[PDB]
Amino acid sequence: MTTINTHLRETLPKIPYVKAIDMYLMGCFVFVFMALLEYALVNYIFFSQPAR
Amino acid sequence: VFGVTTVLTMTTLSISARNSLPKVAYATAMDWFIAVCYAFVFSALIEFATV
């Protein structure tokens, strides 16, 4: 996601506002980020109870 | 790591690959080849997920 974001960003001007494509890329990034954090949370309480 | 890293390499080759042709709005033949190959890589990974 970071590679995609950095490689497809430099073909535009340095505009401050959030574009639609920037919104979509940040959405995809927060989704995969919360997925990894969710895994971290699953691993945090894996040793104690496997049911949760 | 096989599946995910080959998907990442498919992403790197596709990003590298898009600098060759202009910014046309239709799919070329190389675009179809890259799409089918990416589909095969993704299909291989989901097949691994199933197994």
Swiss-Prot record, chain A:
Effect of residue 3 to P: In IECEE2; loss of localization to the cell membrane; retained intracellularly it affects the cell surface expression of the GABA receptor; decreased GABA receptor activity
Clinical disorder: Epileptic encephalopathy, infantile or early childhood, 2: A form of epileptic encephalopathy, a heterogeneous group of severe childhood onset epilepsies characterized by refractory seizures, neurodevelopmental impairment, and poor prognosis. Development is normal prior to seizure onset, after which cognitive and motor delays become apparent. IECEE2 is an autosomal dominant condition with variable age at seizure onset, ranging from early infancy to 6 years.
Ranges per topology, Extracellular: 9-26
Tissue/organ expression: Isoform 1 and isoform 2 show reduced expression in schizophrenic brain. Isoform 3 shows increased expression in schizophrenic and bipolar disorder brains while isoform 4 shows reduced expression.
Record family assignment: Belongs to the ligand-gated ion channel (TC 1.A.9) family. Gamma-aminobutyric acid receptor (TC 1.A.9.5) subfamily. GABRB2 sub-subfamily.
Compartments in which it is found: Postsynaptic cell membrane; Cell membrane; Cytoplasmic vesicle membrane
Official protein name in the record: Gamma-aminobutyric acid receptor subunit beta-2
Effect of mutating residue 20 to V: In IECEE2; uncertain significance
Oligomeric and partner information: Heteropentamer, formed by a combination of alpha (GABRA1-6), beta (GABRB1-3), gamma (GABRG1-3), delta (GABRD), epsilon (GABRE), rho (GABRR1-3), pi (GABRP) and theta (GABRQ) chains, each subunit exhibiting distinct physiological and pharmacological properties. Interacts with UBQLN1. May interact with KIF21B. Identified in a complex of 720 kDa composed of LHFPL4, NLGN2, GABRA1, GABRB2, GABRG2 and GABRB3.
Result when mutating residue 32 to I: In IECEE2; uncertain significance
Positions of transmembrane segments: 27-47
Record function comment: Beta subunit of the heteropentameric ligand-gated chloride channel gated by gamma-aminobutyric acid (GABA), a major inhibitory neurotransmitter in the brain. GABA-gated chloride channels, also named GABA(A) receptors (GABAAR), consist of five subunits arranged around a central pore and contain GABA active binding site(s) located at the alpha and beta subunit interface(s). When activated by GABA, GABAARs selectively allow the flow of chloride anions across the cell membrane down their electrochemical gradient.
Domain notes: The extracellular domain contributes to synaptic contact formation.
Range within the parent protein: 285 to 331 of 512
Curated annotation (Swiss-Prot), chain B:
Biological role: Alpha subunit of the heteropentameric ligand-gated chloride channel gated by Gamma-aminobutyric acid (GABA), a major inhibitory neurotransmitter in the brain. GABA-gated chloride channels, also named GABA(A) receptors (GABAAR), consist of five subunits arranged around a central pore and contain GABA active binding site(s) located at the alpha and beta subunit interface(s). When activated by GABA, GABAARs selectively allow the flow of chloride anions across the cell membrane down their electrochemical gradient. Alpha-1/GABRA1-containing GABAARs are largely synaptic.
Gene this protein is translated from: GABRA1
Entry's disease: Epilepsy, childhood absence 4: A subtype of idiopathic generalized epilepsy characterized by an onset at age 6-7 years, frequent absence seizures (several per day) and bilateral, synchronous, symmetric 3-Hz spike waves on EEG. Tonic-clonic seizures often develop in adolescence. Absence seizures may either remit or persist into adulthood.
Annotated family: Belongs to the ligand-gated ion channel (TC 1.A.9) family. Gamma-aminobutyric acid receptor (TC 1.A.9.5) subfamily. GABRA1 sub-subfamily.
Stretch of the intact protein here: 284 to 334 of 456
Compartments where located: Postsynaptic cell membrane; Cell membrane; Cytoplasmic vesicle membrane
Extracellular compartment spans: 19-28
Domain notes: The extracellular domain contributes to synaptic contact formation. The GABA-binding pockets are located at the interface between neighboring alpha and beta subunits.
Protein name: Gamma-aminobutyric acid receptor subunit alpha-1
Organism domain of life: Eukaryota
Further remark: Functions as a receptor for diazepines and various anesthetics, such as pentobarbital; these are bound at a separate allosteric effector binding site.
Quaternary state and interactors: Heteropentamer, formed by a combination of alpha (GABRA1-6), beta (GABRB1-3), gamma (GABRG1-3), delta (GABRD), epsilon (GABRE), rho (GABRR1-3), pi (GABRP) and theta (GABRQ) subunits, each subunit exhibiting distinct physiological and pharmacological properties. Interacts with UBQLN1. Interacts with TRAK1. Interacts with KIF21B. Identified in a complex of 720 kDa composed of LHFPL4, NLGN2, GABRA1, GABRB2, GABRG2 and GABRB3. Interacts with LHFPL4. Interacts with NLGN2. Interacts with SHISA7; interaction leads regulation of GABAAR trafficking, channel deactivation kinetics and pharmacology.
TM spans (from-to): 1-18, 29-50
